[model samples]
Every structure is written in structure tokens, then in C-alpha cells.
Target: CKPKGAPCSPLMYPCCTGPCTFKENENGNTVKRC
Candidate 1:
């Protein structure tokens, strides 16, 4: 839920178990694969 660099768009703030899943990659990059 606290992945770095995760973009919080329409939601403004990413929500856990809600609508977004912000997972960070090994290189410290947050990729929204969901």
C-alpha cells in the first residue's frame, strides 16, 4: 500500500483494498500492474 512513486490520480490518494494497488518494483519504481 505504501509503494514509492505510486501515482495517485483520480483518487488523489491511493486506497488499500479499495480501488488501487501501488506496488513498487525492485528499482524503486511503482508500477500499477492492476
Candidate 2:
């Protein structure tokens, strides 16, 4: 899990907060809202 307000990514599952989002990574994995 990632710290609240800290940068995060979908690859880093099990986030500790809500209001999260996901975006496609041109390179590969999806990015998450932080």
C-alpha cells in the first residue's frame, strides 16, 4: 500500500485510500491516482 497523498500506481495494488483512478502507461502497466 502507498502512503496517503503520496504518488501511487495501479501496479502498486492495495492502496490505503479512496478516490483512486487508473491510466494507461504507454510503456506497459497502468498508473494510479495519488
Candidate 3:
């Protein structure tokens, strides 16, 4: 789970911290959050 203001990234990282966000890639998988 992501924190209140962290970004969630499965490809970039293993998980999120604060406000979470994810971007869907062409493969239907999330690339990563910034």
C-alpha cells in the first residue's frame, strides 16, 4: 500500500511510501510513479 503523499511504483521500485500513483504501460503493467 502507498502512503498519504508518496508515489507507487512497481517497476521503478518494490512499493510506495506516501502519495501513491501508477502509470499503465503498453504491456498493461504499471511502469512506475514519479
Candidate 4:
């Protein structure tokens, strides 16, 4: 499972800390991450 701040996708690599969500990072592109 992916931990916080790690890149993730809906197909796999779920979050370890919480639910995977789509949020923009420093790059400013909406992405899925833990």
C-alpha cells in the first residue's frame, strides 16, 4: 500500500494512512495520492 505523500492510482496502490484522494500537489495538477 502507498503511504502518505506517495503517488497512487485508483486501479491499485491504495493508501495506507487514509483513503486515496485527488488533490493538487506542488506541481498544481490534480492527482491521486495518499
Candidate 5:
């Protein structure tokens, strides 16, 4: 399981500590982090 700020995908990586949702990163792009 992945933690926060760790890049992930619904079909691939899943969130363990937090929500596995898309959020804007420093690069100003929406990505799945958990």
C-alpha cells in the first residue's frame, strides 16, 4: 500500500493511509496521490 504524496493509479497503486484521489502537485497537474 502507498502513503501520502506517493503517485498512484486506481488500477495499479492504491491508497492506504489516505484517500486515493487526484490532487494538484507542484507541477500544477492533477495526479493520484495517497
Candidate 6:
């Protein structure tokens, strides 16, 4: 999986399909909210 500062689309990545969700970090990075 990508780091904590990478753009990821919903259902686009394996991790996104779980309980995690996408959220923009303080640095404006769309990371997986696990």
C-alpha cells in the first residue's frame, strides 16, 4: 500500500475497500483513513 501522504481513490486500492476511508491530510494528501 501507499504511504500516509498519497492520493487514493475510493475502492481504487485494496485497503480502501475495508473499514478504512479516504481523507485529505493536513498536507493536502488524500490518504487512506484506517
In terms of lDDT, which candidate is stronger, 1 or 2?
A: 2
Summarize candidate 5's per-residue lDDT along 1-34 as a digit string, tens digits. 7776677565677667566665436545555465
Clashes of 1: 0
- In candidate 2, which residue pairs get closer than 3 Å at backbone N, Cα or C atoms, i.e. clash? none
- Candidate 1 regions exceeding 4 Å error are 1-6, 9-12, 16-27
For model 2, how does the per-residue alpha-carbon lDDT over 1-34 read when each residue is reduced to its tens digit? Answer: 6545555665655557774344335435445544
- Whole-model lDDT per candidate: 0.45, 0.51, 0.44, 0.63, 0.62, 0.45
TM-score of each model, paired residue for residue: 0.19, 0.33, 0.20, 0.50, 0.44, 0.30
Model 5 worst lDDT run, 10 consecutive residues:
23-32
Model 6 C-alpha lDDT versus the unseen true structure: 0.45
Using lDDT as the measure, name the better of candidate 4 and candidate 6. 4
Report the C-alpha lDDT of model 1 over 1-34, residue by residue, as the tens digit. Answer: 5233445433456544445444425434456622
Measure candidate 2: CA RMSD: 5.0
lDDT of 3: 0.44
lDDT tens digits by residue: candidate 6, 1-34: 5344445444544442344345436535545443
| Model 6 misplaced stretches (Cα beyond 4 Å) | 15-34
Q: Which ten contiguous residues of candidate 1 have the minimum total lDDT?
A: 2-11
lDDT of 4: 0.63
Clashing pairs in 1: none
Error of 1 at 18 (Å): 6.4
